[PDB]
Design a protein around this ligand. Structure first.
Ligand SMILES: CCCCCCCC/C=C\CCCCCCCC(=O)O[C@H](COC(=O)CCCCCCCCCCCCCCC)COP(=O)(O)OCCN
Ligand SMILES: CCCC[N@@+]1(CCCCCN2CCCC[C@H]2C(=O)Nc2c(C)cccc2C)CCCC[C@H]1C(=O)Nc1c(C)cccc1C
Lengths: 615, 73
């Protein structure tokens, strides 16, 4: 029992007598008398943790002691039992402690190289301490930056680990390697490095195995997983991965065609990129929820930006302009129909003159467009199935078009219920309608960035300013109404006085609007305090804060606009009819080279011509 | 040890406004095992690339008198 205590001091004396005692009892090191009741802690494990200088002398001796009990193959493969570490193996502890010699020693004695370290501690879970690495010694060696140990575990003699073995969540080594990255400098450096290393190793060991297309339980390739979770560095490396080794040349993802003088034609592989496929990187990035960081930045990496711009310039620009024009005519007709409404009696109204026929046609088309936008909003709410937070924090334009449609439908309901209030609803639907044309500013770079900044101000600065301004306005309005005696425009009401004090903010206020108090000095002091606080201080401070915000969101605005255009391009391509949507697949089909087995490697590649002046 | 103001070196560094000394003292970590008990920031387990750390809260939390938080505030 106190064998752990002896090993903690690395004392080999007591184990010599322990061997004789075991031979006397004919017992084994794996018996329950030598395991912690709640953790299943074995002597080999305790020896492995309580290392000194990376090497403990009692480990080999315990190995022979087990062997004369015929327990070498069973003691080494002993694992924890407690749910927190359930699945941890002494090989794992060897890996994380970074002991090459001890790893070789354990693998010699029949240690399993496929032990699923799948306890509670080794699962990706927010809020609690832990470290997710893929539940395998191969994956743990990969995620802890031991290139030598992984090379050994792949190319040893006793037992070689499986490169394509998946864990509980179904991650290969590449999926765990992606999921460990966190978009810093050195982390990205070593993650990309060892990703490349494992690709070459897999190409050597299994030349006929396309390691990078294995999918986890969600059916996400490592590329798509990197795109989804927001690992920008890994994505940047993968999309531009170029390998010069002739044996691993087929594994490259960015080739060249010709290099006449200083100009090259670099081909990029569009497999799993262009939206013709499933879970394509473009679709994954564009439709990603706002929780995923770097969502705006991920469009900056080659060849994504060039690919989107090519799609736009080639067949989406025209469709977007046509949509803009159709919406313009829709709002023009809606405005002319609402403007010329009859102003007598109760709805519905009779059809008397030819102008009545035209106005009825306009009303019909307006309601039809409102219904169309209503159904489109429903379809968006179904297909995305966004969460409530994503619904009210991210869309902001599907929501607005949907809201306009809601107002249109309320208008028609009120109209056929013989209510005058329909006008109310309609005018709201009219105002929103026009103020939704800012949506189409997406199609133009300068105006699109401008509209993105408008959004950013409304959300950052205007909200805070409005809260403080409302507090001040309400406080001083209550004070003034209290001071004002009988109003007999009788500003002895809270509404009228709030309006009067609001006039000050728009540069139209009157300092002597009532004359109907008992203390002129108090009234003047209150109004001067209000003017100083809101008109002079708050409004100018708002201008200053907008200036600072403009200064700080110069690049975020451009990124957000580019992402908005990306979403528009993707939606347009998906919705466009099939008679030509296939006729405009992006890229060209080119024979890059030869597969490792030897055959024409036709790929859908996107060509970019560049120039370099180091030759 | 306290001076005639009953004002400990950590408390004095906090009150007088010496920030570099305070930053040192509150994250004082000593490698020497013979005097390792002096330190105030203790690593607790370092599995792989993650570390749990314990920061001593003695004479920092408000439960004492002349605590660092109260003196700064
Ligand atoms: C970016 C989005 C911008 C949207 C901006 C919307 C802001 C509008 C918010 C509240 C104002 C809406 C309606 C307020 C008052 C209209 C109803 C009304 O007039 O009833 C009034 C009372 O009804 C009420 O509930 C109002 C109670 C007064 C306290 C509310 C103060 C609002 C006054 C509006 C001006 C204040 C501007 C503040 C905004 C920055 C009585 O006046 P009367 O009808 O003319 O005479 C009958 C006696
Ligand atoms: C609130 C900003 C939305 C920004 N937004 C939509 C633009 C629509 C134009 C509407 N106007 C804009 C300017 C004035 C306000 C508003 C308006 O009508 N007010 C208003 C009302 C409420 C009642 C009565 C009268 C009026 C005038 C910009 C384009 C994209 C959609 C979305 C966006 O930014 N979405 C996104 C995100 C967040 C993050 C990442 C990615 C994306 C796509």
């Amino acid at each position: 029992r106190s064998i752990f205590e002896a090993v903690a001091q690395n004392n080999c004396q007591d184990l010599e007598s322990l061997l004789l005692f075991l031979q006397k009892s004919k017992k084994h090191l794996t018996d329950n008398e030598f395991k912690d009741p709640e953790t299943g802690k074995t002597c080999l494990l305790k020896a492995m943790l309580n290392l000194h200088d990376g090497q403990n002398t009692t480990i080999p001796l315990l190995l022979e002691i087990a062997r004369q009990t015929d327990s070498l193959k069973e003691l080494v493969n002993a694992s924890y039992t407690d749910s927190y570490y359930k699945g941890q193996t002494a090989l794992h502890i060897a890996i994380e402690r970074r002991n090459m010699a001890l790893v070789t020693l354990l693998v010699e004695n029949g240690a399993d190289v496929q032990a699923a370290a799948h306890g509670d501690f080794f699962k990706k879970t927010k809020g609690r301490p832990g470290f997710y690495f893929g539940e395998l010694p191969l994956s743990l060696a990969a995620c802890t930056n031991q290139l030598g140990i992984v090379k050994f575990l792949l190319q040893n003699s006793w037992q070689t680990a499986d490169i394509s073995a998946r864990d509980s969540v179904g991650n290969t080594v590449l999926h765990a390697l992606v999921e460990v990255a966190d978009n810093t400098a050195d982390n990205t450096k070593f993650v990309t490095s060892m990703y490349n290393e494992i690709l070459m190793l897999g190409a050597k060991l299994h030349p006929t195995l396309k390691l990078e297309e294995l999918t986890n339980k969600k059916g996400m390739t490592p590329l798509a997983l990197a795109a989804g979770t927001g690992k920008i560095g890994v994505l940047a490396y993968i999309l531009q991965r170029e390998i010069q080794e002739p044996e691993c040349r087929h594994l490259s993802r960015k080739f060249t065609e010709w290099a006449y003088g200083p100009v090259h034609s670099s081909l990029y592989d569009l497999s799993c990129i262009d939206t013709c496929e499933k879970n394509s990187v473009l679709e994954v990035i564009a439709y990603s929820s706002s929780e995923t960081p770097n969502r705006h930045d991920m469009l900056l990496v080659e060849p994504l930006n060039r690919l989107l711009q090519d799609k736009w310039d080639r067949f989406v620009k025209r469709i977007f302009y046509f949509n803009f024009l159709v919406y313009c005519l829709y709002m023009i007709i809606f405005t002319m129909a609402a403007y010329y409404r009859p102003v007598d009696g109760l709805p519905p109204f009779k059809m008397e003159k030819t102008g009545d026929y035209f106005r009825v046609t306009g009303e019909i088309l307006s309601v039809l467009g409102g219904v169309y936008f209503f159904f489109r909003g429903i379809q968006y709410f179904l297909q995305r199935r966004p969460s409530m937070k994503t619904l009210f924090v991210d869309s902001y334009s599907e929501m607005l078009f949907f809201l306009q449609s809601l107002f249109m439908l309320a208008t028609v309901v009120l109209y056929f219920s013989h209510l005058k209030e329909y006008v109310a609803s309609m005018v709201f639907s009219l105002a929103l309608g026009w103020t939704n044309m800012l949506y189409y500013t997406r199609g133009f770079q300068q105006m699109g960035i401008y509209a993105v900044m408008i959004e950013k101000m409304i959300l950052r600065d205007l909200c805070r300013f409005m809260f403080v301004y409302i507090v001040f306005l309400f406080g001083f309005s209550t004070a003034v109404v209290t001071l004002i005696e009988d109003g007999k425009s009788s500003y002895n009401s809270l509404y009228s006085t709030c309006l009067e004090l609001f006039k000050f903010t728009i540069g139209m206020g009157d300092l002597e609007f009532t004359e109907n108090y008992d203390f002129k000095a108090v009234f003047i002091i209150l109004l001067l305090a209000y003017v100083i606080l809101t008109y002079i201080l708050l409004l100018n401070m708002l201008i200053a804060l907008m200036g600072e915000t403009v200064n700080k969101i110069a690049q975020e605005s451009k990124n957000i606009w580019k992402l908005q255009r990306a979403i528009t391009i993707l939606d347009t391509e998906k919705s466009f009819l099939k008679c030509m949507r296939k006729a405009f697949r992006s890229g060209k089909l080119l024979q890059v080279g030869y597969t490792p087995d030897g055959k024409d490697d036709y790929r859908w590649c996107f060509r970019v011509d560049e120039v370099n002046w180091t030759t």
